[model samples]
Target: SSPGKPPRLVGGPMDASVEEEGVRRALDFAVGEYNKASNDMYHSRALQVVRARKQIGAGVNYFLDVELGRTTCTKTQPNLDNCPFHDQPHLKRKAFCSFQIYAVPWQGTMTLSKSTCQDA
Candidate 1:
């Protein structure tokens, strides 16, 4: 018999690196959902990820703090990735947002659970 004991089950939110692929994917999805729910004519994208964390449950919960900037692409555009930020200072806009996303990778499912933003 082994002398070692079983490891304790740790349960709580844990810090996640913004550079992680899974976190990046979740950020992208959350940004897309934000643009869809916004009334603005132009679309926005994540400029930077300030903080990120993950909590394990039935699905993974992603808690993200991100900075977003308005892009020149309008809602009518099909490709947001190609859109660039406005060159004119007056047209430039940015915001800091907190987003919570739930993802079930095995099922290929993801959802924006909550989001809040303020102008930066």
Candidate 2:
């Protein structure tokens, strides 16, 4: 890519921390909805970012990896013996979720990618 310009602010530039909190808020929203729908689901915590980058031509790219605590299985079997989910009777399990936030520098644009609450 050639020498590019600084990202154009769309709604006025916000701190990167704001974006991070935005990701967290997005996760909380999803988890809240999931919790409302599933008796076996619970909001866990955000993990380390899987990937992140900034470029003059491409703007910014951020990927956050999160884990949600849930009951993966219902049966009290040995398969879950090694599972790390806290022993919450029938509510014990864990899952990974990915959130992608990308920016379009040329257009001074940034958008949050669709997130998957559970595994594919």
Evaluated with lDDT, which candidate comes out highest?
A: 1
The sequence of per-residue lDDT tens digits that candidate 1 reaches over residues 1-120 is 122333222457777566566566667678777866566665566666779787866677889998766655665776544554332232345567899987775697877888888763
The lDDT for every candidate, in the order shown, is 0.67, 0.44
What is the clash count for each candidate, in the order shown?
0, 1
Tens digit per residue, CA lDDT, model 2, 9-30:
3343333332344444444444
Q: What is the TM-score of each candidate against the true structure?
A: 0.60, 0.36
Candidate 2 deviation (Cα RMSD): 11.8
- The alpha-carbon lDDT assigned to residue 50 of candidate 1 equals 78
